[PDB]
Amino acid sequence: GEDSLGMEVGYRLIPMVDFQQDGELLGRIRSIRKKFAQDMGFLPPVVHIRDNMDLQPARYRILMKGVEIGSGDAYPGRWLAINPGTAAGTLPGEKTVDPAFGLDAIWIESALKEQAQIQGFTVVEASTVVATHLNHLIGQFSAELFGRQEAQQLLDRVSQEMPKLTEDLVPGVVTLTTLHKVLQNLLAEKVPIRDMRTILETLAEHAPLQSDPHELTAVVRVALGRAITQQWFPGNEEVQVIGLDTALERLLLQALQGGGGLEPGLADRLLAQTQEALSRQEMLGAPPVLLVNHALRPLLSRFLRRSLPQLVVLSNLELSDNRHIRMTATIG
């Protein structure tokens, strides 16, 4: 009954979503959905747009299965001047916060656009503010948006290109339930699922031996290690990562191996130090990537990303073996 993905708008935002008028936001939505399909392998559901007149005139909401996941203001006659961290001074206008990243921002008249840019502000128009927020929410909720129906539709599409591979695999070797869970686990850590041949071929080799979607996910991630490596370290420059202090690594390994647990305070400090390492990577311009021993990757991914979803936790078995790695930050 409820649309998988929906948007509600006050009356001032109707033009940017009206195919008979300017409809600028409709074209941005299409590019967002196309870019997710091509880059992540995940065609998001259509965004059902409807007017809502008890909403403020310049207000929009974004909803998933009828549950609001985001909202904000967009003023068609104004630009949003966003301070990325380097802007200088202030501008007159409605002070706010950019909906995607939480950065300080100001809605400004058109006549201040260039002045704001000279002051180092990133200046975007109203429809782009909404699009950016939607694009961010689709990314944040990619796994939740990829339900069983979505998994079936994708399997049906790939079946057209790879009929024999898909026939030998589902449902006799891996069920849709298991395939959906593995694909969801990949999307949950921002791993693209566009390379369905490698994914299905890997499941075909290991599903007969391991029915656990958790273990399949680890083996699929290794099979996709080149795509994962190029996602966070595109090109051929030095791979700059966070690493664990050597002593910490062994304390965690021996805790999972029944050799003695770590005091709870050490876990809290582990989390605090991961946040500090993230801030350092950001300051260095390096990726938000923590590289760890294969045996630790699922644990630390779940433990740390619960509080720090921006963190990427990779296994040493996933990182392309021809890359030069440098630990630019150390946790512990």
Numbering used by the authors: 359 to 690
What do the study authors state?
The globular cytoplasmic domain of Salmonella enterica serovar Typhimurium FlhA (FlhAC) encompasses residues 362–692 (36.4 kDa) and is tethered to the transmembrane domain via a linker (residues 328–362). We determined the crystal structure of FlhAC at 1.9 Å resolution, which shows high similarity to a previously reported structure solved at 2.8 Å resolution of a longer FlhAC construct that includes the linker (FlhAC−link)26. Multiangle light scattering (MALS) data showed that FlhAC is monomeric in solution whereas the linker in FlhAC−link promotes a dimeric state that, based on the crystal structure, is mediated almost exclusively by electrostatic contacts. Indeed, FlhAC oligomerization is very sensitive to the salt concentration in solution. Structural comparison of FlhAC and FlhAC−link shows that the linker does not alter the three-dimensional fold of the protein. The cleft is hydrophobic and is lined by aliphatic and aromatic residues, as well as several Thr residues. The binding cleft is the most conserved surface in FlhAC highlighting the importance of this region to the function of FlhA.
